[PDB]
Amino acid sequence: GNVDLVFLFDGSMSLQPDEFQKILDFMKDVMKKLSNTSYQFAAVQFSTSYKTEFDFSDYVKWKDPDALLKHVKHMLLLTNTFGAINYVATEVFREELGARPDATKVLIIITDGEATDSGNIDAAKDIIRYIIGIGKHFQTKESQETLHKFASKPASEFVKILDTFEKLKDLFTELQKKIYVI
Ligand SMILES: CC[C@H](C)C(=O)O[C@H]1C[C@@H](C)C=C2C=C[C@H](C)[C@H](CC[C@@H]3C[C@@H](O)CC(=O)O3)[C@H]21
Ligand SMILES: [Mg+2]
């Protein structure tokens, strides 16, 4: 059918410049691969606050992933995940911003630490949520369990834990083998 996909990427202070970059490159790889498909994209950066780097309308209008994310400025603050999510839910998946009413709403969260806030994600009930946790902060099984609450059930299917940002490349290779013409 139609897939409206939003990348919710972590731009906290824990990230080294090169790690932030690998996050941006992953997003561009996926978008470059699925260009001219049924997929529509939007990108939202989160730390303390939230910024929509580009919405579904910009994507359709300019279509170039490199131009779309060219002026992203790393925020360097905390990780307010609950707020970031309801923000997407309520401010990004909006028709005025180019979201298609008959589209499946998928949300891919990319983070490197646990959440520095709280609340609930009820506004995001009908959104498919994948969570990609990367790095040292998710070494313990205990810290990996904190992500389960932002992701769709079953977590083993929706939560991805990578030990290095180098692994995001291996994740893209794994994504590519599931690409099929229907
Ligand atoms: C597909 C395997 C890769 C590693 C992956 O998980 O990509 C997931 C997670 C992430 C690596 C990027 C994605 C980009 C596009 C789609 C939404 C993809 C999930 C596609 C699957 C296939 C159907 O069951 C629909 C669905 O809900 O999820 C995600
Ligand atoms: Mg962090």
Curated annotation (Swiss-Prot):
Chain positions carrying an annotated carbohydrate: 36
Modification after translation, per record: In resting T-cells, up to 40% of surface ITGAL is constitutively phosphorylated. Phosphorylation causes conformational changes needed for ligand binding and is necessary for activation by some physiological agents.
Entry comment describing in which tissues the protein is expressed: Leukocytes.
Subcellular location: Cell membrane
Domain VWFA: 4-175
Annotated function: Integrin ITGAL/ITGB2 is a receptor for ICAM1, ICAM2, ICAM3 and ICAM4. Integrin ITGAL/ITGB2 is a receptor for F11R. Integrin ITGAL/ITGB2 is a receptor for the secreted form of ubiquitin-like protein ISG15; the interaction is mediated by ITGAL. Involved in a variety of immune phenomena including leukocyte-endothelial cell interaction, cytotoxic T-cell mediated killing, and antibody dependent killing by granulocytes and monocytes. Contributes to natural killer cell cytotoxicity. Involved in leukocyte adhesion and transmigration of leukocytes including T-cells and neutrophils.
Family: Belongs to the integrin alpha chain family.
Assembly description: Heterodimer of an alpha and a beta subunit. The ITGAL alpha subunit associates with the ITGB2 beta subunit. Interacts with THBD. Interacts with CD226. (Microbial infection) Interacts with SARS-CoV Orf7a protein.
Record's comment describing the protein's domains: The integrin I-domain (insert) is a VWFA domain. Integrins with I-domains do not undergo protease cleavage. The I-domain is necessary and sufficient for interaction with ICAM1 and F11R.
Protein name: Integrin alpha-L
Stretch of the intact protein here: 153 to 334 of 1170
